[PDB]
Symmetry: C2
Subunit: 181 residues, 2 copies
């Protein structure tokens, strides 16, 4: 078990420890990894190397960018929590391969645009949190409006920042035809 | 259509209009009612006259209290959004009768206690939002840990404020055995 962490029952906790680098020597069999409340600015490239990992909590960090390699090779991942970071741009293939992912939180970031096709591989995703973001509700967000409107995937919290008449309207219930360019 | 609102084919919006009481003249056939961003202090009991109403949005109001009586007669309701209000605790029968409810948001309140049985009749509930609440995760909250663990319902935002070591711990994955008195 890393010095900075506690390890119990394949669950590894390194929460609120002032970390900006992944602790060395995390158990190979880790299933739940809690890195909330630290000072990471990037997703560590190594998280891909933990082949049993089904939950990642990186909430309340300083993460400003993702790469198309960030969650690569994580076909087993169930829960991905990126709440309360500094995300804005979401690379189009960031979530590729994540065919087991059920829960995704992007709530509390600086996101205006989620590119179409970003959820192409996310066929098991049942619960999206994407509130507390300045969503720009033009035709480029129309696909997401349609996506959340099947089986209550977003909880009526996320709202358009704009433009114009879209101001303060819920992502969930606003008709997809109103998302125009 | 109320003077304080805009209406389109059974959807009635009265958002950000400085209201503290329901506008008079809500059409009898209303299906979605948006009262977000006003100064309501209670859920109006007269909402139960509108028998086709399946979505109520009361986000961003000043609701400090619910009654066991709040949602009497409103059996058809599918969505109830109470985000960003002043709620401290859910009375145990406040959601009785809401057997069709799919989505309930209590996100962004002051809730420390949700009493056992509050979700008894919520057998259709598939998405709960209860993040940004100072949840007090003692034995009186163990049932809620078990409830969110029983099925995929909550995307990993809800957190314990306490007691003690329970501070900052996720409701979703923190073992129910830790919810003690």
């Amino acid at each position: 078990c890393p010095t900075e962490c506690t390890c119990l029952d394949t669950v590894v906790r390194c929460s609120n420890k002032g970390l900006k680098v992944l602790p060395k020597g995390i158990p190979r069999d880790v299933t739940e990894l809690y890195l909330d409340g630290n000072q990471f600015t990037l997703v560590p490239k190594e998280l891909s190397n933990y082949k049993h990992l089904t939950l990642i909590d990186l909430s309340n960090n300083r993460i400003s960018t993702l790469s198309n390699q960030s969650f690569s090779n994580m076909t087993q991942l169930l829960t991905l929590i990126l709440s309360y970071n500094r995300l804005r741009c979401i690379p189009p293939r960031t979530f590729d391969g994540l065919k087991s992912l059920r829960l995704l939180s992007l709530h509390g970031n600086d996101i205006s645009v989620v590119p179409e096709g970003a959820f192409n591989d996310l066929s098991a995703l049942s619960h999206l949190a994407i509130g507390a973001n300045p969503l720009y509700c033009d035709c480029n967000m129309q696909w997401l409006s349609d996506w959340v409107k099947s089986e209550y995937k977003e909880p009526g919290i996320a709202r358009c920042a704009g433009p114009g008449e879209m101001a303060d309207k819920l992502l969930l219930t606003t008709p997809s035809k109103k998302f125009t360019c």
